């Protein structure tokens, strides 16, 4: 084929075949003419090398080349390699009725449905719309229907909502590693140009929303619609196939909304009042007469199913909070009240959904996963859980710990000037005292964050776990750990140079205090090594998955 212009961009195999035929014609003419021995030996040898270069180029000494120094691609190089026929056109194919766009959240969704734009929906479903238009009788020939959807008149959007309705689509994030990276949804049409994807499902795709893209595929035939609904639907994938752990675990905002909701404080509005049900618990929270965390005797009716498939009601007064009753309005019947009576971090909400799946089955667990996500988003919005510069509380004991460590390294180096100790024992003593001082700084800041709030109730003071914002983001397990909150308040440890050995002078400044120049440069050693490790580790991880699914 010619490219855009007036010349033909010729393939490499035409060069190979044209050389074999040029040489073969020369050899026939020389055997006609009775050339001497050395001429026809060179001629047959050039034909041998030409045939051997046509079949598998470069297996003989240095491969032939046309333009410019790059070798030209032979038949065996049309078969082998990453870009042969197996790995590029027979195992993986390019696919019609498919689309691709940037994802975004849309938290109003139920977890069996996803948002799909109107422009992509009218392009992916052109033949179904053509068939629907031809059934009604609005048009006659196929051309008329293609002009109608090329113009996009007022009547094809009702046709589109009547071809969408019960027709699942396969959403697919581009590095699909396990089977939960292709899931089938039902479309809900979107004014917009971005796929709205239900948030819980994101933890299956490893999909954040920092610029990600996903592909949509349409199951055309009827068996494929039934496979998308009965095997690949997103309600059907709620447990990861690698183990027994649920994969629709609530990820980050919703566990903060729950951890702020089901908690307590030693005095609030409506401390120790008594409530006749969870409905008036939410009514007291909404009207402005109690607080979301205020300990209260309620009367809850938990249904324990102790018989053989019969739900027995037991009603009692639990000493609980307001938020635990409001969250009890969403729990299905069979679970006991003690699943919400605690503080509900992330491990606790994961085993809440797991006990709901083991007891009440699939359908209450799907609808209860949605109600968890809705109430987590709503009370995280009502929480106003910001992050400030004052939330990262510096330990008051931090500077004296650093000065005691500086006195200790001064003692060790004064022994080093007088030669009492060895050099390796000096390096070991310095790394040991900076590890001990690091642990002491972490314990100072961790006490100063985990119990900083000290509020009185009707008299003398009484302490409790803190409502500091970074501490709830750490204790809830939403985002953060001990190490990250340690590096934002306490000293950020002893960073290591790329030699593999550690550096004897640590980074005594956290991020709330400023790092100076040398400390940031040592930090950049430690972080450039991590980025290089991930960006080169991913190739071995993918090649390991390939070898494993081809031995299986």
């Amino acid at each position: 084929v010619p490219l855009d212009g007036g010349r033909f961009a010729t393939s490499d195999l035409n060069d190979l075949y044209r050389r074999v035929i040029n040489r073969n014609n020369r050899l026939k003419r020389l055997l006609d003419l009775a050339a001497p021995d050395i001429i026809v030996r060179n001629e047959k040898r050039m034909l041998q090398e030409a045939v051997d270069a046509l079949l598998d180029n470069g297996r003989r000494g240095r491969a032939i080349t046309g333009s410019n120094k790059r070798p030209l691609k032979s038949l065996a190089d049309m078969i082998k390699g990453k870009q042969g026929r197996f790995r590029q056109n027979l195992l993986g194919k390019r696919v019609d009725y498919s689309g691709r766009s940037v994802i975004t959240v849309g938290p109003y969704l139920r977890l069996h449905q996803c948002g799909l734009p109107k422009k992509m929906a009218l392009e992916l479903f052109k033949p179904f719309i053509y068939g629907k238009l031809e059934l009604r009788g609005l048009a006659t020939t196929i051309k008329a229907a293609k002009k109608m959807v090329e113009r996009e008149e007022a009547v094809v959007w009702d046709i589109l909502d009547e071809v969408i309705r019960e027709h699942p689509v396969l959403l697919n994030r581009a590095p699909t590693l396990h089977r939960l990276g292709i899931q089938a949804f039902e479309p809900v049409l979107i004014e917009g140009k971005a796929i709205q994807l239900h948030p819980l499902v994101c933890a299956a795709y490893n999909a954040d929303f920092d610029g990600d893209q996903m592909a949509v595929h349409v199951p055309l035939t009827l068996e494929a619609q039934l496979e998308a609904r009965a095997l690949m639907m997103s309600t059907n994938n709620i447990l990861s196939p690698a183990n027994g752990e649920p994969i629709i675990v609530p990820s980050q905002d919703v566990v903060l909304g729950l951890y702020y909701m089901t908690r307590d404080c030693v005095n609030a509005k409506g401390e120790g009042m008594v409530l006749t049900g969870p409905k008036e618990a939410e009514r007291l929270y909404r009207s402005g007469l109690a607080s979301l965390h205020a300990r209260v005797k309620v009367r809850i009716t938990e249904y324990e199913k102790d018989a053989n498939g019969e739900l027995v009601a037991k009603t009692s007064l639990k000493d609980t909070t307001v938020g635990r009753a409001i969250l009890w309005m969403i729990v299905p019947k069979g679970l006991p009240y003690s699943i919400v009576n605690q503080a509900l971090g992330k491990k606790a909400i994961s085993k809440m959904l797991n006990t709901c799946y083991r007891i009440l089955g699939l359908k209450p667990t799907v609808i209860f996963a949605d109600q968890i996500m809705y109430t987590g988003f709503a009370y995280a919005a009502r929480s106003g859980a910001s992050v400030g510069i004052d939330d990262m509380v510096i330990p008051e004991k931090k500077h004296e710990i650093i000065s005691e460590a500086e006195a200790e390294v001064a003692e060790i180096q004064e022994q080093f000037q007088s030669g009492l100790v060895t050099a390796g024992e000096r390096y070991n003593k310095v790394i040991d005292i900076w590890a001990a001082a690091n642990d002491r700084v972490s314990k100072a800041m961790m006490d100063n964050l985990q119990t900083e709030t000290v509020i009185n109730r009707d008299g003398q003071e009484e302490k409790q776990v803190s409502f500091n914002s970074i501490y709830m983001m750490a204790d809830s397990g939403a985002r953060g750990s001990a190490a990250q909150i340690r590096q934002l308040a306490g000293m950020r440890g002893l960073m290591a140079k790329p030699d593999g050995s550690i550096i004897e002078t640590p980074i005594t400044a956290n991020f709330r205090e400023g790092l100076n120049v040398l400390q940031y440069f040592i930090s950049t050693h430690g972080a450039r090594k991590g980025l290089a490790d991930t960006a080169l580790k991913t190739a071995n991880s993918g090649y390991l998955t390939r070898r494993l699914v081809d031995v299986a």
């Binding site: 056109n89 766009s101 849309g106 396990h178 914002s469």
Partner: protein, 1322 residues
């Protein structure tokens, strides 16, 4: 004092450390390199003169003619840069070289030549550099990126562990020339020394010594010291210097002087060496078992019989001693082969050597280098004497000789370019010393061992390739030269030089397309140091250590600005203050510290000098004298950050920005961010699109000014003065007299580049930021470019941001945006698309440009004229027609008429047409000809008249010393004017002088306008081949929408999720909604805490802005404004700014306060930024709460959010990953040729590659039918997909699968081998 656009809006500058060295010109690498390449520099170094003095004078092989050189020159470019980008030509210059041919007679080395000839011949065109550091190669604007490669000169590398699988180290030594053959020495685990040349076969290394005319005895003289056995009274005693016994076991009885020194069994200690030196012990009698393992040094022959006793390098036995003792050779020289220190590596290599003399050594080297073809005396000697020893094919440069003498601890640094005997012998000696223990290896990441190539060096190497090809051509033509009938262009040819230099500037791995969407991105693509390219490492192979940051990067390479992905740490970006060494290394400034007092003199160092000295830290507290206020200070000695004394240091860092680059020193509060998020923040900050309304970062670092000036996107004033401000077309600046030349009266007319296409389809546009009649100074800015605001650098815009979860719409990293952001068009960016249409004559006649578009009805002839082509302007969308361009016979007509692509809208801003000389109808082509024709003359006369007006007044102005008669000077109006005599006393010939000016003005204007019409009157200017050349420039205006990507400066990426109404936003109690809600959960994990301090400090900045907006709106007399502005500019600790505000004339306070009512801009520098107490104190100057947190109500429910939230102003950027460039869908369209599967991409309307892991994921489910239609019906099988399309549109979802076509393609490709693959029984 300040300049006049500095007093417009002076940014509140935190920062305690006084800067001593201002920032160098940020494009100096590109400009200094290319100014080195083209410059007339006598003494030859470096440049084009080095190329001509290497290649010339050419003399042929005794052909008695010798073409020599005189001088070269570059003429004017025929196309200036703008019309060069428009047309598509290179931006080049013709290289006029004077060449002087002299031709000899017979027998004239000394005789005078018989004839000369000389001419200014023309070879090539070299592409000049634009004033901003760019090229224009073929219409497009490209940048050569500076390479980072291994220096020439010896390197002693180890490879300690991986080979031999036994933990035994090797030690190789590579002599890397700048041009020529590579010579490597290397041990092997048998402890033998091996040479290899150009990574070829392995020769035992002493053969190269035997190739340098060294006998075996001379080699053993070099690499071994002699132990002397004297034949004496009995048992052949030994000279013993006591150094040789260090650390060995006493095998025999060590006694002398009648005294037993050391007995057998104990090892010899250094106290025993002191005993032997104090007792003066040299000669001791040895047993016969001591010599029975040693090796002879030189040859010995039996004197009377006349034959050989033993060859050199022969081990000794007792009967050999009975041979040599009875002959009469009293001295025996043995080789001291210490197992600890002085190993016998050369001697065992000589035992491996199959050669004996020089000639067989050269024959074996020639059989290594060029195999098959025979090894004769002349051929092998010419090979080996031109491998390393001739000036043509082997040349360590000056850098190579400096590194080569420095790594061998030589004294000198300048020497000859070739090697010698002594250099190869010294490399072998240092390698042996490293094996013995003394001296150590070199590392390759050490930036003293790592040179930079730049534009001038790379273009000079390519130009030298072209010159050696043209000298082989000149040697060709001259021996076939007949004289005198040729002049020097039948010999020389302009083709190979131009071919080579356009090969490099067009298709190389470093001459690459400029990332141009941003002033930052231009100025940080020009400052780029790539490890890749020719002669360097590759992306997909290496490695771990070359991708990692080494302690010599401090102040030379940015540690944190490197692109994430497949090439991390290969594409390093250069630091802010780092220049380039004379040899090409990276030297960075330091402040010389003689004693306690840190001196303000600067001094540049590279990494092979930074190790020796002790260099302080940038921020170490020194007060009022330079004395370090502590008695101990953190420094770094040899790449090790350690704490040293007050008075030991020799250098200090210059300024605290100097570690990082110009991409990541624009991030305020860098020191509070993590390193990873600073990397992601700088790499995204390169990617910002220019918004429609540029908006001044409230929290900047003060480096915005230098980046916005030094990248040439703003129209910086060349000569200061006032202004005339016609400006609709050009800024016209009248020049003050001190900066103004005596002749060339002169006023500067700046060209503003209005709406045009960038390289990334963004819009580069300049707008004047000075009014009419306003003073400007030299170096001041006049026109704000893209993403600039009054000379600062405004990539994104500053918006009110709340940190809270808001109903899930900002879940992972999403961002929830009000409607006030999209109503104000405060991200509505402008994109420009160039679309070409050509009507080439493929076949069956030429194609045609006519509106008489076929089949298609009264839906073709619409946005066009009666003669075809889009009629300009208009609200064109997708599926429209721009250029009717269709042929007959292609009832056989078709529609190739270039239309508008699917999904885009826009306005036709410009239509260019340099078409096939004929595009015209009956007259538009010549209709506009007269328009431009009359235009030229008009301005031509106008300009003359403009100067004439100024000159006429000037005539009268000077008319005072020679006729001031006001009533006797207003005679003729447009006729003459001055008519008075003068004589002498004072020179008033001024009238005569100005008379010539006007006289020459009119005389030159005619000629100027004479060529104008000549140029005007023309078909059009372009190349041949292509016929119909119609380029149409659309300009889409994209706003913002759910799905775009925004980001701050700290690494906080986001896809804007919901575009809320104004009402539903979280409003504080004052009533203002917040603009953008981010998510707090990103902040504890991604440890980029700097965005919060930017949020609080931007809140304080707009607090001052709201306070000034109240004091100026509710208008107060300027005393209260200058008092509040003075309080705002004093504010807190000891800073550098304060202000001199009472000298702003009671109006420059008000113009400043007009430019501050949107918020007081604050410079928070990079590592010496604003502390937290100053943020709190500035939040107390404004009336804002000290915590940074305001209680916010909810727009939905009207009720307060508990636990007050953070609101502030973050500077958020819109990155050019827009969602309606990514949205794509395909049902059915076109496919490829070879395969039956769909095409790929978006510009090709193609479908999604359902790859391999998705097939494994469908196999993981039970999706057997979904996969079957996913690879047979939807993709490949042609009968299956046509039956499926008809089955769908009938209303029958059922597939008739069949077999994929690409599998039958597989069968024919396998079967086209000798392979019979089939398909068996039914």
């Amino acid at each position: 004092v300040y300049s006049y656009t500095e007093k417009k809006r002076i940014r509140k500058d935190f920062g305690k450390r006084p800067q001593v060295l201002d920032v160098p010109y940020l494009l100096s690498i590109q400009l200094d390199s290319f100014q080195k390449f083209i410059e007339q520099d006598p003494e030859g170094q470096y440049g084009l003169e080095a190329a001509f003095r290497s290649v010339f004078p050419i003399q042929s092989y005794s052909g008695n003619s010798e073409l020599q050189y005189v001088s070269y020159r570059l003429g004017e470019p025929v196309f200036d840069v703008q019309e060069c980008q428009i047309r598509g030509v290179t931006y080049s210059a013709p290289l006029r070289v004077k060449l002087r041919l002299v031709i000899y007679e017979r027998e004239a080395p000394e005789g005078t030549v018989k004839d000369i000839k000389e001419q200014e011949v023309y070879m090539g065109e070299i592409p000049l550099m634009t004033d901003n550091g760019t090229f224009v190669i073929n219409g497009t604007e490209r940048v050569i990126v500076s390479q980072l490669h291994r220096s020439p000169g010896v390197f002693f590398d180890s490879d300690k562990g991986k080979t031999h699988s036994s933990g035994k180290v090797l030690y190789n030594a590579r002599i890397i020339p700048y041009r020529g053959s590579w010579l490597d020495f290397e041990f092997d685990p048998k402890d033998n020394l091996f040479v290899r040349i150009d990574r070829r076969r392995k020769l035992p290394a002493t053969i190269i010594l035997r190739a340098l005319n060294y006998t075996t005895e001379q080699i053993l003289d070099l690499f071994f010291e002699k132990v002397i056995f004297e034949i004496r009274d009995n048992k052949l005693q030994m000279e013993l210097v006591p150094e040789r016994l260090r650390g060995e076991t006493a095998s025999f009885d060590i006694e002398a002087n009648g005294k037993v020194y050391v007995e057998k069994g104990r090892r010899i200690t250094a106290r025993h060496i002191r005993q032997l030196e104090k007792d003066d012990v040299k000669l001791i009698e040895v047993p016969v078992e001591y010599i029975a393992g040693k090796v002879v040094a030189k040859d010995y022959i039996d004197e009377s019989t006349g034959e050989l006793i033993c060859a050199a390098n022969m081990e000794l036995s007792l009967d050999l001693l009975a041979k040599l003792s009875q002959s009469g050779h009293k001295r025996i020289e043995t080789l001291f082969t210490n197992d600890l220190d002085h190993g016998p590596y050369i001697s065992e290599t000589l035992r491996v050597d199959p050669t004996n003399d020089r000639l067989s050594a050269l024959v074996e080297i020639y059989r290594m280098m060029r195999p098959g073809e025979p090894p004769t005396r002349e051929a092998a000697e010419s090979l080996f004497e031109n491998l390393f020893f001739s000036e043509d094919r082997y040349d360590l440069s000056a850098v190579g000789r400096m590194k080569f003498n420095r790594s061998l601890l030589r004294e000198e640094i300048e020497g000859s370019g070739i090697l010698s005997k002594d250099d190869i012998i010294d490399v072998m000696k240092k390698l042996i010393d490293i094996r013995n223990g003394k001296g150590e290896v070199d590392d390759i990441d050490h930036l003293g061992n790592r040179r930079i190539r730049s534009v001038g060096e790379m273009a000079e190497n390519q130009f030298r390739v072209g010159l050696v090809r043209v000298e082989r051509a000149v040697k060709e033509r001259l021996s076939l030269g007949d004289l005198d009938t040729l002049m020097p262009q039948d010999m020389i040819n302009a083709k190979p030089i131009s071919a080579a230099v356009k090969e490099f500037f067009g298709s190389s791995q470093l001459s690459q397309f400029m990332d141009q969407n941003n002033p930052l991105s231009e100025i940080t693509h020009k400052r780029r140091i790539s490890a890749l390219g020719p002669g360097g490492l590759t992306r997909e192979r290496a490695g771990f250590e070359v991708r990692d940051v080494h302690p010599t990067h401090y102040g030379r390479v940015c540690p944190i600005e490197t692109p994430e992905g497949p090439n991390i740490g290969l594409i390093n970006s250069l630091s802010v203050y780092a220049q380039t060494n004379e040899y090409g290394f990276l030297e960075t400034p330091y402040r010389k510290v003689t004693d306690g007092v840190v001196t303000d003199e600067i001094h540049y160092l590279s990494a092979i000098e930074e190790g020796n000295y002790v260099i302080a830290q940038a921020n170490s507290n020194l007060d009022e004298e330079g004395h370090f206020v502590e008695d101990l200070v953190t420094c770094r000695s040899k790449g090790e950050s350690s704490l040293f004394s007050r008075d030991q240091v020799d250098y200090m860092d210059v300024s605290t920005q100097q570690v990082v680059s110009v991409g990541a020193s624009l991030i305020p509060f860098l020191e509070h961010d993590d390193a990873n998020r600073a990397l992601m923040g700088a790499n995204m900050q390169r990617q910002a699109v220019p918004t429609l309304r540029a908006d001044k970062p409230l929290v900047g670092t003060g480096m915005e000014r230098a980046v916005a000036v030094d990248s040439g996107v703003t129209a910086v004033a060349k000569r200061g003065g006032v202004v005339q401000y016609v400006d609709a077309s050009r800024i016209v600046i009248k020049v003050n007299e001190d900066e103004m030349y005596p002749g060339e009266a002169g006023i500067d007319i700046y060209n503003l580049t209005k709406y045009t296409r960038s390289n990334q389809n963004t819009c580069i546009n300049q707008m004047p930021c000075v009014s009419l009649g306003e003073p400007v100074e030299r170096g001041d800015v006049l026109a704000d470019g893209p993403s600039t605001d009054l000379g600062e650098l405004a990539l994104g815009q500053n918006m009110r941001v709340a940190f809270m979860p808001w109903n899930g719409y900002n879940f992972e990293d999403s961002i929830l945006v009000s409607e006030r952001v999209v109503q104000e068009d405060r991200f509505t960016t402008i994109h420009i698309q160039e679309l070409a249409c050509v009507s080439r004559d493929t076949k069956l006649g030429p194609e045609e440009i006519t509106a008489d578009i076929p089949n298609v009805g009264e839906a073709a002839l619409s946005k066009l004229d009666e003669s075809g082509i889009v009629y300009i302007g208009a609200e064109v969308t997708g599926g429209d027609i721009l250029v009717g361009k269709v042929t007959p016979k292609g009832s056989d007509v078709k529609d190739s008429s270039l239309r508008v692509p699917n999904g885009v809208s826009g306005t036709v801003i410009d239509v260019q047409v340099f078409t096939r000389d004929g595009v015209e109808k009956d007259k538009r082509a010549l209709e506009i000809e007269e328009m431009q024709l009359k235009q030229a003359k008009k301005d031509l006369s106008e300009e003359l008249q403009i100067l004439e007006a100024g000159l006429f007044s000037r005539i009268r102005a000077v008319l005072v010393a020679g006729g001031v008669e006001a009533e006797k000077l207003d005679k003729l109006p447009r006729d003459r004017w001055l008519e008075l005599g003068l004589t002498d006393e004072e020179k008033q010939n001024q009238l005569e002088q100005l008379a010539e000016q006007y006289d020459e003005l009119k005389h030159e204007f005619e000629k100027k306008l004479e060529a104008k019409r000549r140029k005007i009157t023309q078909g059009d200017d372009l190349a041949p081949g292509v016929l119909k050349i119609v380029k149409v420039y659309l300009a889409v205006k994209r706003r913002i929408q759910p799905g775009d990507k925004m980001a701050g400066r700290h690494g906080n990426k986001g896809v804007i999720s919901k575009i809320n109404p104004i009402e539903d936003m979280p409003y504080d109690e004052n009533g203002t909604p917040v603009d953008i809600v981010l998510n707090p959960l990103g902040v504890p994990s991604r440890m980029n805490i700097g965005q919060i301090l930017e949020t609080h400090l931007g809140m304080a900045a707009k607090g001052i802005g709201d306070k000034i907006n109240a004091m100026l709106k509710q208008q107060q007399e300027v005393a209260k404004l200058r008092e509040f502005i003075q309080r705002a500019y004093d504010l807190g600790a000891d800073v550098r700014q304060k202000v001199d505000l009472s000298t702003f004339s009671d109006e420059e306070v008000m113009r400043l306060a007009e430019n501050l009512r949107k918020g007081m801009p604050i410079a928070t520098p990079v590592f010496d930024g604003a502390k937290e107490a100053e943020i709190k104190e500035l939040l107390k100057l404004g009336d804002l709460p000290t915590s940074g947190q305001i209680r916010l109500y909810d727009g939905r429910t009207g009720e307060q959010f508990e636990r007050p939230v953070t609101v502030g102003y973050m500077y958020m950027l819109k990155l050019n990953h827009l969602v309606d460039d990514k949205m794509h869908a395909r049902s059915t369209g076109s496919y490829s040729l070879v395969t039956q599967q769909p095409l790929g991409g978006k510009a090709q309307f193609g479908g999604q590659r359902f790859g391999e892991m998705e097939v494994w994921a469908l196999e993981a489910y039970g999706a057997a039918y979904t996969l079957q239609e996913m690879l047979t019906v939807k993709s490949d099988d042609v009968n299956g997909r046509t039956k499926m399309y008809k089955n769908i549109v009938d209303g029958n979802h059922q597939m008739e699968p069949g077999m994929p076509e690409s599998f039958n393609v597989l069968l024919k490709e396998i079967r086209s081998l000798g392979i019979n693959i089939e398909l068996e029984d039914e």
